[PDB]
Amino acid sequence: YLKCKGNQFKNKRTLIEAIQREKNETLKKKAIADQLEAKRLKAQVLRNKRKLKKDKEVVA
Amino acid sequence: GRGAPLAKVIFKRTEKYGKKEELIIASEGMFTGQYISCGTKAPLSVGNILPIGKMPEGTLICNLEHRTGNRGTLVKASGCYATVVGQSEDGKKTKVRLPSGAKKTIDAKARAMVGVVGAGGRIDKPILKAGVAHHKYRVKRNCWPKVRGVAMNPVEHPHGGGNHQHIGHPSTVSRSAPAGQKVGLIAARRTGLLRG
Amino acid sequence: PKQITDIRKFLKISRKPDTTAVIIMKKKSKTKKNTVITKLKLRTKKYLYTMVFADRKKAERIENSLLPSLKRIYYP
Amino acid sequence: SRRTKKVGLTGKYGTRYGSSLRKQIKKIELMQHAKYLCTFCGKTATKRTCVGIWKCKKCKRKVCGGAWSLTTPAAVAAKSTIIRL
Amino acid sequence: AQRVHYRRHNHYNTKSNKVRPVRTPGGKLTIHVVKKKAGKPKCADCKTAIQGVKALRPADNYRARRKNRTVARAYGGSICARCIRERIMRAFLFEEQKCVRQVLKE
RNA sequence: UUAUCCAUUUAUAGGGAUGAAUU
RNA sequence: GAGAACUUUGAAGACUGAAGUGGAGAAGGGUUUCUUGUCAACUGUGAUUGAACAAGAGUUAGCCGCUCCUAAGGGAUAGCUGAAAAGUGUUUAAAGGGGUCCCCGUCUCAAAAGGGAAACAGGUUGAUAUUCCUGUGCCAAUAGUAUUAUGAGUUAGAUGGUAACAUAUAUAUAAAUGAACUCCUUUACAUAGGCUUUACACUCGGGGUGCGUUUUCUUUGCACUUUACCUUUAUAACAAACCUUGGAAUCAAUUUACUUGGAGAAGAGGUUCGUUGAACUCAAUUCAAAAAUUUGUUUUGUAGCAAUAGUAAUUCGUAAUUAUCCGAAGUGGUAAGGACUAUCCUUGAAAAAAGGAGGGAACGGCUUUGUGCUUUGCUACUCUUAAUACUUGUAUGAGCGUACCAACAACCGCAUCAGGUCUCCAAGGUUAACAGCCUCUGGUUAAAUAGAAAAAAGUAGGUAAGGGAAGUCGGCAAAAUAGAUCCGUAACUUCGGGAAAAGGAUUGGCUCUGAGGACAUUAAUGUUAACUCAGAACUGAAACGGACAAGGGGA
RNA sequence: UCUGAUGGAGGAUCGAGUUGAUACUGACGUGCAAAUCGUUCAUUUCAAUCACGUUUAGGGGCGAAAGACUAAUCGAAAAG
Ligand SMILES: [Mg+2]
Ligand SMILES: [Mg+2]
Ligand SMILES: [Mg+2]
Ligand SMILES: [Mg+2]
Ligand SMILES: [Mg+2]
Ligand SMILES: [Mg+2]
Ligand SMILES: [Mg+2]
Ligand SMILES: [Mg+2]
Ligand SMILES: [Mg+2]
Ligand SMILES: [Mg+2]
Ligand SMILES: [Mg+2]
Ligand SMILES: [Mg+2]
Ligand SMILES: [Mg+2]
Ligand SMILES: [Mg+2]
Ligand SMILES: [Mg+2]
Ligand SMILES: [Mg+2]
Ligand SMILES: [Mg+2]
Ligand SMILES: [Mg+2]
Ligand SMILES: [Mg+2]
Ligand SMILES: [Mg+2]
Ligand SMILES: [Mg+2]
Ligand SMILES: [Mg+2]
Ligand SMILES: [Mg+2]
Ligand SMILES: [Mg+2]
Ligand SMILES: [Mg+2]
Ligand SMILES: [Mg+2]
Ligand SMILES: [Mg+2]
Ligand SMILES: [Mg+2]
Ligand SMILES: [Mg+2]
Ligand SMILES: [Mg+2]
Ligand SMILES: [Mg+2]
Ligand SMILES: [Mg+2]
Ligand SMILES: [Mg+2]
Ligand SMILES: [Mg+2]
Ligand SMILES: [Mg+2]
Ligand SMILES: [Mg+2]
Ligand SMILES: [Mg+2]
Ligand SMILES: [Zn+2]
Ligand SMILES: [Zn+2]
């Protein structure tokens, strides 16, 4: 909306192309960030289960 | 016609069931919805109306009576104020300093408003156009523009006539001159640029 | 003028002391043939009241049962 | 783009009246047409309606003030004096 | 095209002599004079338009229906609802504060 | 201070301690 | 007709060109208006004409105005001054009043453009028309008593909704108690800028009817195809404001521009005003389901007014009858409303009149001891609108204007004078254009004269070889330039300008190419517009803002 | 600080009406006219322009100032 108010698109077709390109890129960034966040979260369970595996033995 | 704003203020009748209306020159800071108090025992604050004998030294005042019960005569134009400068030993007298720089002693029971008159500082804008001055005096009185006496004929003015547009006469006249003759600088103690 | 779409109200108006005339208008429809549209109008002191009848049979019944003291006026 | 180097607001006056008078007009009218904080409601929406009357576009209170600005120093000084007492 | 003229006494274009052309069954253009608008009645406190009443010139207001000129509350069609709410709160709470202050004298 | 002059008001309590108010 | 250049009729050729010798009003005039007659003088030539002369006619209002209110102001009353004549106008009036026993507070005139109860369409005369005729409406007023009907309340004054708010449909939405006193609202208001909606106007294509052209062409060129006030008109649609729920940063919503939100935004669901005035299946009509409120369609109606009127046609007779009156869009001239933005040492009337609210005075009726307060029953009485009957002064709608001109010969200027003199309506083509030029509706073809001839001289114009201000006090007068698009613009400067500086190129017609939207079946298909802008080929006696319109530049 | 758009200020700019009157020292000068006619000029959002009503009266009024204007009369109107 603010882009169109600033005289960036002189035509309807150009606006459609621009929004499609932006949509693809903002989908790809999410699709990389979410998978990195999930994979990073997974390794928190091993790190928080080996703690109790050690502490059930030595810490008492 | 006037440069300063007016406050419309409503009091409540005390001898009877009803309401009454007043028009008062507004001091700088007043707002719609404010309660002001008028009387001999009212607290000292901006917009209250008090007798001048209950004000300490240095108080800035406006809308003053030069005689008691007068309903106000002295400090009224926009941006103007007076100063309390002395209280007498036995009461009954109060000394103030007026905007022109004169000093005066007043009855100590006369009334005034605390604060300065609003909308002050309006002679700091250049007028810059003849039409603006046409619109200024359009709502005051018929006194604009002005032809100068050196550009008339002798029948209409003491300065009129001549082959070169001069006065030819000393332009400072005396206090006793008749009505058709008191026309230049009236009873002038002094002429020229001031240097102090 | 005013319009009425309730038959009972129409017959109530006809019997009142200051109804003095009825108008009958017959007119072929603009769509087809054999379509005698009819309007019946009551002249009271204040307003004409108009009721529209699409059925020539029911309409033809209506003004038969209409009280004899009303003057009748035929426009077509 | 920037449409004017110097005269800014006084470009409506053209070439008339001389440069120094236009400078004083510019200084005065910068204050005259600005916005001021309303102390009653918190928004900055107070604008001048006449030579001494100021009004808030949101809460709709009217405050009596200066000619070209909302406060002049001389009134602020006296108010501070009274409040100190 | 067909051209028109004033039918009434006033022949000048004042605010009370406004005009609107109209086509007749006999096939001609004619003039008709237009009534002036009427301001909306306003709240006695905040000077805002009162909801639920009609805006009529006082001649048309005189012969208008009774329910078209009023609302059913403590101040009807003279003070708006926000103002009435604030008035009620002011009354009750200031009386409570005065009564609290009265007892504390001792 | 009573002649004389001025001012104010509906000639409306003798001096000191941004609700509503009438029968 | 005794007598026709300037009386009338028909046929031609032309003008006005909606900023009109077209329509309607004010000031001013006063019968100039209409019908008939008519020529002594007038109508600067004629005249049978005429605003001239003579006889008789013609102006119709509850709804158009005045009459009422107040304005800038005028005249007055008390008092005071002055020989008076006059000047001034609460300056210490025991005044003016209104309210039913009190309070408020001078009188009167001044607006035919300010304020302000109420009306429309068709027809009609030789001369008047929102005034007459026909039909349909509206506004204001309408005593007392009694009866009869319309509805409502109580067995002393009604209800619904959480809320914003809503409710009386009787022939007709007429009734929802309210005193003294008090407070508000309408009447009621400047300028500039763009955006938007709706009516009137204009235009394109279908259907019907009539007319025109027709050696050749032409599914063709023109005309008509209408719908007022009033019914709170019902209901739709829309710019706004407010209510309920909800709970906002990854800030959102949104305009051409803007604007707005924890003092409660978006989303979802509601209430009201304004605009407008049949839009929306709007109203009736069940074919069959859902109630002791639904589907395509029941099919009707220009929603009533309303076709019975108006217009265009075809008829038969010496007032007569029939058929049409209906399908889809575009352009943006004029007027009004809406929500906004901005400007001011400028902030842009009043009164008559009308409405809303606070407060709570008083009060169920009919006879029932007495002196307004003391005694017994019925738990029909209280409002409201309409009609009737009787008593009452005779229980609707006063008085004045209304013909005509408004300059072209009706006015002022000594006149039938090329002068002066206030307001509203406003078609087609070309075009930025209500300019100029040409045209349709309406108006005219008239001017104190005509025919012939055509030299000097004059007045208003048009051209000129070669030179180009040498003419003259002086480039006086006249020429040269000019629209729009694309390029390019100095000194100086108060930095805003100078500037259209100076300068250079292009412009017709015809045949094509490209760019800019909306909508519905799902990116894929389909329908469907308005006007501008940019390129290419071809073409002509090298011409093209072709007429009109339209800067000379510089030191 | 620079670039593109949006936006619509100003006693801004051309210009028809309106209000005026620069040149031809044009016509006319026994006029159409006791101030007209033609062409050419100045002005159009503001100190703008019109209409009615109203106030100011002669040695006085009114004047963005020319001794201008005050009913064809003004360096002191008109009637007796
Ligand atoms: Mg001089
Ligand atoms: Mg002298
Ligand atoms: Mg000099
Ligand atoms: Mg000397
Ligand atoms: Mg209501
Ligand atoms: Mg003649
Ligand atoms: Mg012509
Ligand atoms: Mg011509
Ligand atoms: Mg023209
Ligand atoms: Mg005649
Ligand atoms: Mg005759
Ligand atoms: Mg003659
Ligand atoms: Mg005669
Ligand atoms: Mg009459
Ligand atoms: Mg009238
Ligand atoms: Mg007055
Ligand atoms: Mg009067
Ligand atoms: Mg009027
Ligand atoms: Mg006539
Ligand atoms: Mg008439
Ligand atoms: Mg209709
Ligand atoms: Mg007439
Ligand atoms: Mg005369
Ligand atoms: Mg003559
Ligand atoms: Mg004439
Ligand atoms: Mg010649
Ligand atoms: Mg030649
Ligand atoms: Mg030559
Ligand atoms: Mg020479
Ligand atoms: Mg020589
Ligand atoms: Mg010389
Ligand atoms: Mg020349
Ligand atoms: Mg230059
Ligand atoms: Mg200008
Ligand atoms: Mg000459
Ligand atoms: Mg001339
Ligand atoms: Mg001289
Ligand atoms: Zn505020
Ligand atoms: Zn309110």
Give how far Cα B30 sits from Cα of B118, B173, C8, D68, D71, Å.
Answer: 9, 47, 72, 17, 12
* Nearest neighbour of B30 by CB, restricted to D25, D64, D66: D64
Cα(B148)–Cα(D19) distance, rounded to whole angstroms?
Answer: 29
Question: E21 near E29, Cβ under 8 Å?
Answer: yes
**Per-position b or e across B152-182, b if 16+ CB within 10 A of its CB:** eeeeebbbeeeeeeeeeeeeebeeeeeeeee
Helix (H) or strand (E) holding E102: helix E81-103
Beta-carbon contacts of B159 under 8 Å, excluding residues fewer than 6 positions away, are B148, B149, B150, B152, B167, B169, B183, B184
* Nearest neighbour of B31 by CB, restricted to D62, D75, D79: D62
Residue B17 tokens, joined? 């069931």
Nearest residue of D to residue B29 by CA position?
Answer: D64
In the sheet with B111-114, reading across from the earlier edge strand, the strands are B49-51, B111-114, B60-62, B82-87, B93-97, B103-107
Residue D74 tokens, joined? 């001389």
Interface test with D, best of B2, B9, B28 (most D CBs within 10 A): B28
Cα(A36)–Cα(A28) distance, rounded to whole angstroms?
Answer: 13
Radius of gyration in angstroms for the set of CA atoms belonging to chain E, rounded to a whole number: 26
Helices (H), chain A: 2-5, 12-47, 50-55
Contact D68 B44 (CB under 8 A): no
What residues pair up with D48 in beta bridges, in sequence order? Answer: D54
Q: What is the distance in angstroms measured between the alpha-carbon CA of C27 and the sugar C1' of G313?
A: 21
Question: Resolution reached, in Å?
Answer: 2.5
Say which experimental method was used.
cryo-EM
Q: Do chains B and C touch (3 or more CB pairs under 8 A)?
A: no
Largest CA distance in chain C: 40
For residue D40, give the DSSP letter: T
Q: What is the distance in angstroms measured between the alpha-carbon CA of E63 and the sugar C1' of G253?
A: 45
* Cis preceding-peptide flag for E41 (omega within 30 of 0): no
In chain B, residues 109 through 128 whose Cβ sits under 7 angstroms from any atom of nucleic acid strand G:
122-123, 125-127
Please state whether strand G lies within 7 Å of residue E88 at its CB atom.
Answer: no
For tokens 């604009």, name the residue: B144
Beta-carbon contacts of E2 under 8 Å, excluding residues fewer than 6 positions away, are E28, E29
What residues pair up with C74 in beta bridges, in sequence order? Answer: C24
For tokens 């966040």, name the residue: A37
Q: Which residues of B touch D50 (CB under 8 A)?
A: 5
* Nearest neighbour of B31 by CB, restricted to D25, D63, D82: D63
Question: B5 near B27, Cβ under 8 Å?
Answer: no
Reduce the DSSP state of residue A39 to 3 states and report it. helix
Cα(B145)–Cα(B128) distance, rounded to whole angstroms?
Answer: 15
Question: A9 near A1, Cβ under 8 Å?
Answer: no
Reduce the DSSP state of residue A2 to 3 states and report it. helix
What is the DSSP secondary-structure string of B135-171? HHHTTT-S--S---GGGS-GGG-TT---SS----S-S
For residue B185, give the DSSP letter: E
Cα(B186)–Cα(C40) distance, rounded to whole angstroms?
Answer: 99
